[PDB]
Amino acid sequence: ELFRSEEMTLAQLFLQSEAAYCCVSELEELGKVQFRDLNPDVNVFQRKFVNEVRRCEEMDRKLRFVEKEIRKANIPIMDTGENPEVPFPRDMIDLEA
Amino acid sequence: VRKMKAIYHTLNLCNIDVTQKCLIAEVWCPVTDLDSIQFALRRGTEHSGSTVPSILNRMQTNQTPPTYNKTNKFTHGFQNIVDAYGIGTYREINPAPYTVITFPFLFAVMFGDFGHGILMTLFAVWMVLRESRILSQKNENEMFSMVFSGRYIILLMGLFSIYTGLIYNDCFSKSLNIFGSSWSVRPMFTIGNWTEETLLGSSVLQLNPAIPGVFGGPYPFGIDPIWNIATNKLTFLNSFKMKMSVILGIIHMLFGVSLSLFNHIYFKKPLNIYFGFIPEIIFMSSLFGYLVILIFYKWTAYDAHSSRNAPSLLIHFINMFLFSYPESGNAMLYSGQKGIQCFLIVVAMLCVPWMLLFKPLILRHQYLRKK
Amino acid sequence: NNPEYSSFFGVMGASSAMVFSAMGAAYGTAKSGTGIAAMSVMRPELIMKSIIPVVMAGIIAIYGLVVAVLIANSLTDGITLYRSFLQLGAGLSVGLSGLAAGFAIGIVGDAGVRGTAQQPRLFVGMILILIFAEVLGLYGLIVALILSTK
Amino acid sequence: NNPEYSSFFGVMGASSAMVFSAMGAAYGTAKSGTGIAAMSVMRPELIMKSIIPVVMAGIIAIYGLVVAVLIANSLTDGITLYRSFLQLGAGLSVGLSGLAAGFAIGIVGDAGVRGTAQQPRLFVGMILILIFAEVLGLYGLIVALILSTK
Amino acid sequence: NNPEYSSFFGVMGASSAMVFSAMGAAYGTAKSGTGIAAMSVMRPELIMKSIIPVVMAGIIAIYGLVVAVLIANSLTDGITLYRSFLQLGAGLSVGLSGLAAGFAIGIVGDAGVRGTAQQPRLFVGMILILIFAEVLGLYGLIVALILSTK
Amino acid sequence: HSFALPVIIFTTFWGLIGIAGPWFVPKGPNRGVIITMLVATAVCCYLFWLIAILAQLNPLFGPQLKNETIWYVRFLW
Amino acid sequence: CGPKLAACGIVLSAWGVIMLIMLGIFFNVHSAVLIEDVPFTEKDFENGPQNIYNLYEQVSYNCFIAAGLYLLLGGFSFCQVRLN
Amino acid sequence: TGLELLYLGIFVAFWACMIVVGICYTIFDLGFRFDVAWFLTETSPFMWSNLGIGLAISLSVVGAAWGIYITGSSIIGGGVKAPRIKTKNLVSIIFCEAVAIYGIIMAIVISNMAEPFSATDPKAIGHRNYHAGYSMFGAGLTVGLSNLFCGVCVGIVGSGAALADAQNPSLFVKILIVEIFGSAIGLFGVIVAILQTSRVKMG
C-alpha cells in the first residue's frame, strides 16, 4: 500500500533461448520489471549479441539517412498506427536487405 | 528497430557461461506482479516454437532491492519532488502521500492571497482542461513542459491558496465583503465617554483600545476586514502569522517523529524506538508543548480591559528554556508555572544521554556478546 | 520630553534591516548565480535544481524586510529613545547577520553548484550546508524580534 | 517648533534614493552590457533576448526615482524632524537596496548571458535568478514607501 | 537618575554577540563548504562525515544567539550604565571570540576536508583540531555569561 | 451566544471529512492515498482555521484609523 | 497578431473582467475598505455622504468601462486565436 | 599596493571615528557642540575664496598635465614608426592647454573680484560677504575639478587618436570629434563657474 515503499521480489529464471527474445519483448511491453545486470564485463565486443545490436545500430543509421532524404524532399511520413516487434526468426535480414 | 535494439541490449545484460544452454536471468518485480511476469514469460514461450515456460524461483539471499512506487496524474509530481531529494529505503514510509496535502498546504499558508489563489487555480485548470490536446504538442519549451508536468500539484496548491487567502481575508490588500465585522461605527464612540475622540478624528489620527461597550464583540469569521484599511494592521496580522507558523511547525515536526515510530515498527527495531523515538519525542514534546499551550492561554486569559501590563509570550518561553526569570517584571500567567517550566526542561535534558551514548554502549556490548 | 533625535536610531534600525539584508542577499545571488551560469554549460539538466542557493539568499532579504517593516510600523514622534536603541540593535542584529549569512550562501552556493556539476550526489550536501548558512539570517531575525519588542 | 536644519536629512533621503539606485542600475547596466557585447560576436541572435538584465537595471533606477520624487514632493520649509528622519530612512532603504540589487543584476546578467551563449537552456534559469536579484530593489522600495508614508 | 543613552551600549552588546558570531559562523561555513564541494568529486562518500566543521560553525552562531538573547532579556530604559557596559563587554567577548573560532573552523575545515579525502586517517586528528577551534566560542561565551550577570 | 458553536461547526465538518470521508472511500490502489488526503486535509485545515479564530478571540487592541476613515465610518456601514 | 498575442488577450480579458466587476460591486455597495482608491477632496466632507457616494458611482463606472475594454479584447482575441 | 592600503587605512580609521563621534554627540545630548553653524562662520570667507582660486588653477593644471602626458607619450611612441603623427595629433595637446587656459581665465576673474573686509564678527561680516566667500570657493572648485576631469579625458582620447593615426592616416580627422566632446566639459566648468561668481561683492 502506497503509504510506504512497495514490496519487491528478487527472482532468478531459466530463460530458454528460443523464447528469450519473445519473453524480453513481452516483459518490456508489460513495463513492470527491472532486470539485474549479470555481466559486469559488458562492452562493445564483450556483449553476447554484438552483431544483433550492431545491425540495429546500422539499420537505425539507414533509417536516419532515408528519413533525412525524405524530410529534405518534404515527402509526408505517414506515422499511422502502433506496432509489435519483429519475429525472433531471422526476418531482420529481409528488413536489412 | 528501436524495440529490437532494446531487446538485444537487455539480452546482453544476461549471462551465458561456456557450457551454458539456456540463458540465466534475474529480475526485480513487484511482489503483487510476480504472477504478471510469469504470465508474460509463459506467453513469450507461447509466441515461440519453445515449450519451456522459463519459470522463476523467488530469491532469499538478497541485497536491498531498488525502490518502486506506482503513480498517476494526481500523485506523480508529488512522488517526483520527494524522489528529487532522495529515494526511500526499501519498505520505508513514503513522504509522497502525506506530501500530496502538506506541500500544497505549506505553500498556501505562505502564499496567502485569495485573488492569486483564483489566478493559480485558473492557470492550472486551463492546463488540465486542454490536457488531451497538450499531450500531443511540443516539449522543447521547457517552462511549458515543467508547468504542464506540475498541473495537478499546481492546481491543488492554487485551490488551497484560495482557502488560506479567504481566511486571511485578503486579495491585493483588499477584503471580501462576505463577512460581517467586529469593528464599531462612529455612533458607538459618541456615547458621552470618548465622544471627543470622534471630533479629534477630523484633524488627527486616533486608536481604538477595544474597550468593552465600545468594541463590536468577539469575532466569528476569519481575519476581520477592518485590518485591511487600519494603519496599525501589520502588528495584529504579524502576531497571528508568527504564532500560527510556529504552531504549525511544531505540529509538522511532531507528525514527522510520529512517522519515525511507525517506520521503526515496520522494520522491527526495538533499539531505534527505545534509544531514538522515545527520548526524542519526550525532548521535543516537553519543549514544544509548553510553547503552544502558553500561546493558547494568552489568547484566552488576556483581553482589551487587561491588555496594558499583560506579559510577553516569547519572554516566558525564553526564561523557561534558560531558567532565567528574575522573579520580577512581566507577571506569571498561572499557579505553579515556575515548577512546570523547571520540570519540562529537566525532563528534556534527561533524554540526551540515551540519544548520545547509551545506544552506542549497548551496541558495543551486543557486538562483543555476538561472538 | 523624549529626545528629538530619538527616532533617528529607530529609522536606522528599519533601514539597516533592509539594506544590509539586501547586500547579503545580493552577494548570495551574485556568487551563486555566477556558479549556476558557469555550471549550466555542460549541465542543461541541473539548471533548475541549482536555483536553491539563489532563492535561499532571497530569504535573507525577507528577514530584513520582516524586521524593517516591524520596526518601521512601530516608529512614532514620541519614541522613548530606549525603544529606538532596541530598534537599532534589532536592525543590525538581523541586517549584519543577514550579510554574514548571504556571504556563506554566496560562497557555498557557488562551490556547491560547481561540485554538483562534477558529482550529482553533492545536491543533498549542498542543501544541508546552505541550511547552516541560511540560519544565520534566522538567528539575526530572532534577536531582532526580541529586541524590537522588549 | 522645528529646527531649520531639519529638512537636510529628508533631502539626503530624496537624493540617496536616486543616487544609490543610479549607481546600482549603472553597475547593473555596465556589467551586463559588457557581457552582452562579448556574447553577441558568437551569437548575434541572442542580443534582443539578452537585454533583460539591462531592463531590470533600469527598473532599479525607477525604484530610486519613485522614492526620490515621493520624498521631494513630501518635503516642506518646516518639516517635523521625525518625518525628516523617516524620509532619510526611505531614501537609504530603497537606495542602498537598489545598489545591492544592481550588483546582483550586474553579476548575474554578465554570467547568465555568457553562460546562455554556451548553453541556450540557461536563459530560463537566468531570468528566474535575475528576478530574485531585481526584487531586492523592490523590497527596499516596500520599506521606503512604508517609512516615507508612516 | 540613569542617563537615557545608557541602553545604547546594552543593545550594541546584543548586536555584537549576534553579528560577530554570525560573521564567524558564516566564514567557518563558507570555507568548509567550499572544501566539501571541491572534495566531493574525488570522495563522494565523505560528504556526510565532512559536515562536522559546518555544524561547528553553525554552533558559533548559536553562542552569539544565546548571549544576544540573555542581554536582550536584561535590558530596561532605566538600566544603570554599569550594567550596559557589562552587556557590551559580554557582547564583544562572545561575538569577536566566535569570529576567531569561526576563522579557525573555516581554515581548519577547508584544509581538513581536502586532506581527509587523500588520507582518511586525518579525520581522527581534524575533529580534535576543530574542537580546539570551537572551544574559543565557548570561552567567549563563558566570559560573556560572567560579565552579563555581574 | 458563544464562539464555541462556530468552533464546533468547523470541528464537526472536518471531523466528518477525516472519519466518515475515509469510511466512504472505494476499493483500489489509490485507497490509502485518498484516505491520507482526506485525513491530513481535515487535520491541517481544521488546525489552521482553529488557530486563526483563537488568535482573533479577545483582541488586546483595536484598529488605528486615518482622519478620513474616522469620518466615513459614520455612513459606509 | 499571431497566436501568442491572442492567448495573452484571452487571459488578460478573463482576469481583467473578473477583478474589475468585483471592484465595481465593492464600490456600488460603498464598502468602507475602498476609501483609499476614491479620488475625494476636502470639500467632499461637506454636507454628508452624497458627495462620496457620487464618487463611488464614478469610480465603479471606471471599472465597468475598463472591464468593457477587456470584453472587447476578449472577443477580438477569441477570433484571432482561431484565425492565426 | 602599499600607499593604497595606507590611504584606505587612514580613510577607514577616519570614518570609523566619524561614525562614533556622530553617534556620541547625538546620544550624549551634545548637539550644542558639532556646531556646523560655528564652522561655516568663524572660518574666514577669504580661506574659502583662496582655496577656490588656488584649486581653480591647480586642478585645471593637474588635468591638463595628465592631458599632455597621456596624449604626448603616445605621440612620441607612434612617432618613431610614423613621423606624420608629430604635427596633426598636437591639436589634442592644444585642447589640454585649453583646459588649463579655462582654469586661468576663471581664476583671474575670481581673484580680480576679491577685496578686504575691515570687520571680524559674523554679524558685521554679514550675508553678502559670506556668500562671496562660499561662491568663489564653489566656483573655483567647480572650474578646477571640471577641468581636472576634462583634461584627463582629452588626454586619454588624444592617445586614442594618436595610436589609431599611427596605423591609418585617415582616422585622426574623424576621431577628432571625441576630443571636441571632451573639451566641452572644461568649458561647462567655466560657464557655471562664471554664473556661481557672477553676483558676488565683498566689503
3-state secondary structure chain B: CHHHHHHHHHHCCCECCCCCCCEEEEEEEEHHHHHHHHHHHHHHHHCCCCCCCCCEEECCCCCCCCCCCCCCCCCHHHHHHHHCCCCCCCCCECHHHHHHHHHHHHHHHHCCCHHHHHHHHHHHHHHHHCHHHHCCCCCCCHHHHHHHHCHHHHHHHHHHHHHHHHHCCCECCECCCCCCCCCCCHHHHCCCCCHHHHHHCCCCCEECCCCCCCCCCCCCCCCCHHHHCCCCHHHHHHHHHHHHHHHHHHHHHHHHHHHHHHHHHHCCCHHHHHHHHHHHHHHHHHHHHHHHHHHHHHHHHCCHHHCCCCCCHHHHHHHHHCCCCCCCCCCCCCCCHHHHHHHHHHHHHHHHHHHHHHHHHHHHHHHHHCC
In angstroms, the separation between the Cα of residue H18 and the nearest Cα of chain C is: 16
Which candidate from B163, B223, B247 shows the least CB-CB separation from F51?
B247
In angstroms, the separation between the Cα of residue B287 and the nearest Cα of chain C is: 17
Question: Alpha carbon of C139 to those of B240, C52, C98, E96: distances in Å?
Answer: 21, 20, 9, 17
Going by DSSP bridges, is the β-strand pair A8-15/B56-58 parallel, antiparallel, or unpaired?
antiparallel
Q: Which residues of H touch C (CB under 8 A)?
A: 26, 29, 31
Which H/E stretch holds residue B363? helix B359-369
G-chain residues near F71 (CB < 8 A) = 45
In angstroms, the separation between the Cα of residue H16 and the nearest Cα of chain E is: 15
Q: Which residue has the cell 581653480?
A: H56
E-chain residues near H20 (CB < 8 A) = none
B-chain residues near C74 (CB < 8 A) = 235
Solving technique:
cryo-EM
Residue B151 in grid coordinates: 498541473
Interchain contact F48–G (C-beta under 8 A): no
F-chain residues near A1 (CB < 8 A) = 31-32
d(CA H7, CA H12): 9
d(CA H18, CA H10): 12
Cβ distance A15 to B29 less than 8 Å, yes or no, reads no
* C14 burial type by CB count under 10 A (0-12 exposed, 13-18 middle, 19+ buried): buried
With CA atoms as reference, the chain D residue closest to B205 would be D150
Measure the CA angle with vertex A49, ends A47 and A53; round to 5°: 105
Task: Report the amino acid identity of residue E72.
Answer: A
Kindly report the number of other CB atoms within 10 A of residue E17's CB atom: 36
**Alpha carbon H148 to chain centroid, angstroms:** 5
Virtual CA dihedral for C140, C141, C145, C150, nearest 10 degrees?
A: 0
G84, G1 in Cβ contact below 8 A? yes
Measure the CA angle with vertex H33, ends H27 and H36; round to 5°: 115
Kindly report the number of other CB atoms within 10 A of residue B369's CB atom: 7
Return the bridge partners of C60, or none.
none
Q: Which residue has the cell 603616445?
A: H74
Cβ distance B84 to C49 less than 8 Å, yes or no, reads yes
Residues 6+ apart with CB under 8 A from A84: none
With CA atoms as reference, the chain B residue closest to E74 would be B326
Q: Which chains touch C (3 or more CB pairs under 8 A)?
A: B, D, E, H
* D90 burial type by CB count under 10 A (0-12 exposed, 13-18 middle, 19+ buried): buried
In a mutational test of the B interface, the residue from E47, E73, E79 whose CB has the highest number of chain B CBs within 10 Å is E73
Interchain contact B315–E (C-beta under 8 A): yes
Interchain contact C74–B (C-beta under 8 A): yes
Q: Which residue has the cell 553548484?
A: C113
A-chain residues near B9 (CB < 8 A) = 49, 53
DSSP state of H174: H
E13, E95 in Cβ contact below 8 A? no
Q: Which residue has the cell 553476447?
A: A48
With CA atoms as reference, the chain C residue closest to B86 would be C124
Residues 6+ apart with CB under 8 A from G23: G60, G63
B-chain residues near E69 (CB < 8 A) = 318, 322
* B49 burial type by CB count under 10 A (0-12 exposed, 13-18 middle, 19+ buried): exposed
G69, G9 in Cβ contact below 8 A? no
Kindly report the number of other CB atoms within 10 A of residue G40's CB atom: 15
Residue E12 in grid coordinates: 550594541
Q: Number of CB pairs < 8 Å for C and D?
A: 158
Helices and strands: H and E segment counts in chain H: 7, 0
B-chain residues near E14 (CB < 8 A) = none
Q: Please state whether at least 3 CB pairs lie below 8 Å between chains E and H.
A: yes
In a mutational test of the E interface, the residue from C2, C23, C93 whose CB has the highest number of chain E CBs within 10 Å is C93
DSSP state of A34: E
Residue H151 in grid coordinates: 583634461
Task: Report the amino acid identity of residue D49.
Answer: K
**Alpha carbon H116 to chain centroid, angstroms:** 26
In angstroms, the separation between the Cα of residue C30 and the nearest Cα of chain E is: 15
d(CA C104, CA C56): 11
Going by DSSP bridges, is the β-strand pair B206-207/B56-58 parallel, antiparallel, or unpaired?
unpaired
Query: Residues of H176-194 as b/e, b for ≥16 C-beta within 10 angstroms?
Result: bebbeebbebbeebbebbe
**Alpha carbon A72 to chain centroid, angstroms:** 28
d(CA D110, CA D50): 10
Q: Which of E60, B232, E98, B228 is nearest to C135 (CA)?
A: E60
Which residues of E, range 82-141, sit inside 8 Å of C by Cβ? none
Domain count along chain C: 1
In a mutational test of the G interface, the residue from F66, F76, F77 whose CB has the highest number of chain G CBs within 10 Å is F76
With CA atoms as reference, the chain F residue closest to B185 would be F73
Q: Number of CB pairs < 8 Å for B and E?
A: 9
Residues 6+ apart with CB under 8 A from C72: C14, D89, D143, D146, D147, D150
Which H/E stretch holds residue H77? helix H45-81
Virtual CA dihedral for D18, D86, B230, G21, nearest 10 degrees?
A: -10
Q: Hey, CA dihedral for B157, B159, B164, B168, is it positive or negative?
A: positive
Q: Please state whether H126 falls in left (phi above 0), alpha (psi between -120 and 50) or beta.
A: left
d(CA A20, CA A41): 21
Q: Which chains touch G (3 or more CB pairs under 8 A)?
A: B, F
Cβ distance F68 to G40 less than 8 Å, yes or no, reads yes
Interchain contact C8–H (C-beta under 8 A): yes
Q: Which of B151, B153, B147 is nearest to B81 (CA)?
A: B153
Interchain contact B141–C (C-beta under 8 A): no
Q: Number of CB pairs < 8 Å for C and E?
A: 162
Query: Residues of B281-313 as b/e, b for ≥16 C-beta within 10 angstroms?
Result: bbbbbbbbebbbebbbbbbeebbbeeeeeebeb
G49, G56 in Cβ contact below 8 A? no
G-chain residues near B174 (CB < 8 A) = 26, 33-34
**Alpha carbon H112 to chain centroid, angstroms:** 19
Cβ distance B299 to F58 less than 8 Å, yes or no, reads yes
d(CA B262, CA B266): 6
G17, G73 in Cβ contact below 8 A? no
At A13, phi and psi to the nearest 5? -140, 155
Domain that holds residue D78: 1-150
F-chain residues near G49 (CB < 8 A) = 72, 74-76
Q: Please state whether at least 3 CB pairs lie below 8 Å between chains A and G.
A: no
